[PDB]
């Protein structure tokens, strides 16, 4: 039960919405390291994802 | 209209037994029952689908907004300078078949119905 | 693990200049400044990145949960069982070269930084 209809102007505008870029250089600034969090978090995350 | 998007739109319209469109109007709209749905390429090579909610509830919004096993599970957002609530999903076009394009719209309409 | 997922993880570790990890089943975690971030293949052939928040941000119908032009803009949702609030994004492994996987994590962390 589907029909093609005209696109309202505001939907046109929404469909190409832009936000300003963010986080440029952020990973380099904060740095990153491997983490070893509680086993409990890792095991739970495995059940959540399964 | 980029070729991948055009091919995707034509696959969807075939699955909907509709006359293949049209002009090369980028943003298309489909009324599927009670739901006005919009399709766009946004950004390039991605198929975006969204529908504005007409005074549904959002008590379940934060559950709706958690990932599931289905990348097409819709997400419920709000236009900051409009207040309108939009349910949406998106897939990259470099990957798709028709069954997967139709599936994206199925998911959108289903969540809109089932919301809350 | 899935060889394609292992290869993507390898690229990310080159991008972040970290020693390359061994095939660890399940979830890899990274400390990025104050943000603990997790990576997993979910579903098959997609890379899910996420970070557990406490009370910050808005997991309902909000601006964070509206699409933008960048598919890596993360989503804020909540597991109804545990109540845990998770900021997350996802990319198909087919699209993730070194720059793009780096970009995915950066957009995740950028939103985590902003949120109060």
Automatic annotation (TrEMBL), chains B, C:
InterPro entries: T3SS_chp_SycE (IPR005416), Tir_chaperone (IPR010261). Coiled coil: none annotated. It comes from the Bacteria. Pfam families: CesT. GO terms for biological process: protein secretion by the type III secretion system. CDD domains: T3SC_IA_SycE_SpcS-like. This is Probable chaperone. The lineage of its organism: Bacteria, Pseudomonadati, Pseudomonadota, Gammaproteobacteria, Pseudomonadales.
């Amino acid at each position: 039960e589907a029909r093609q209809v005209a696109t309202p102007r505001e939907a046109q505008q929404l469909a190409q919405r832009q936000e300003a870029p963010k986080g440029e250089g952020l990973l380099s600034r904060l740095g990153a390291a491997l983490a070893r969090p509680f086993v409990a978090i890792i095991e739970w995350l495995g059940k959540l994802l399964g | 209209m980029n070729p991948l998007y055009r091919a995707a739109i034509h696959q969807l319209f075939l699955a909907l037994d509709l006359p293949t469109p049209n002009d090369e109007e980028s943003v298309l709209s489909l009324q599927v029952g009670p739901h006005l749905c919009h399709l766009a390429e946004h950004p390039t090579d991605h198929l975006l689908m969204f529908t504005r909610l007409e005074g549904q509830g959002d008590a379940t919004a934060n559950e709706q907004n958690l990932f599931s096993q289905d990348p097409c599970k819709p997400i419920l957002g709000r236009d900051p300078e409009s207040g309108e609530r939009l349910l949406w999903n998106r897939q990259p076009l470099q990957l798709l078949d028709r069954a997967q394009i139709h599936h994206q719209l199925e998911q959108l309409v289903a969540a809109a119905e089932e919301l809350r």
